[PDB]
């Protein structure tokens, strides 16, 4: 299977056609997407083969062949870009200035910006291209529109 | 039977299309990673 690092398509032919239920991105030898696009299922890559290693439903994250690697952060000031990878189109960045999310247990950045579903778990970059997160776990807010969290993980 | 497929490397674009607002929201994230907003 491909190892190379960047950002790929998670299809599926269960359904009518090839279907993309989802992005992920391949770094260290890992691949990392959202639980939600997967549901934890052991992925295809060409013959080869991605088992689970480690996954939680609440952070909405799930990483295969290893331990999850992305560690950057937003710094809270700058413009971030979402590598979009949107379903039949070719991987698009978008700039934007990210809004925050604040809970009981901390603030968290994120992102005013609305792809399809199958969108879920494309990166969110800084400008050194480092992965600071990923898009598609969020709220729709009043006016309807959608507001994705910067979800990252956690570098054991 | 999902399967991965490569779209691209992962690099920041100088004078990529700029876009979004930046709304600051009270959320709330439940034990199924739902998030809800607080009012
Ligand atoms: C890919 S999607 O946009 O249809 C979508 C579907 C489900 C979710 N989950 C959020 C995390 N908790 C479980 C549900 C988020 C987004």
């Given at each position: ?71 950057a ?16 189109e ?46 598609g ?20 | ?27 709330a ?11």
């Amino acid at each position: 299977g491909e190892t190379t690092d960047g950002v790929y398509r998670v299809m599926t032919r269960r359904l009518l056609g090839s279907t993309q239920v989802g992005v992920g991105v391949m770094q260290e030898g890992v691949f990392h997407t959202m639980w939600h696009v997967t549901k934890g299922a052991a992925l295809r890559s060409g013959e080869g083969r991605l088992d689970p290693y480690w996954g939680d439903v609440k952070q909405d994250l799930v990483s295969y062949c290893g331990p999850w690697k992305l560690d950057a952060a937003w710094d809270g000031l700058s413009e971030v870009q979402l590598l979009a990878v949107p379903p039949g189109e070719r991987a698009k960045n978008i700039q934007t200035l990210p809004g925050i999310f604040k809970t009981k247990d901390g603030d968290i950045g994120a992102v005013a910006l609305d792809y399809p579903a199958g969108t879920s778990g494309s990166p969110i970059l800084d400008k050194c291209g480092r992965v600071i997160g990923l898009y598609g776990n969020g709220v729709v807010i009043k006016n309807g529109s959608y507001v994705s969290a910067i979800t990252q993980g956690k570098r054991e | 039977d999902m399967y991965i497929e490569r779209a691209g490397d992962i690099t920041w674009e100088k004078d990529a299309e700029v876009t979004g607002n930046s709304p600051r929201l009270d959320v709330a994230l439940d034990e199924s990673g739902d998030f809800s907003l607080v009012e």
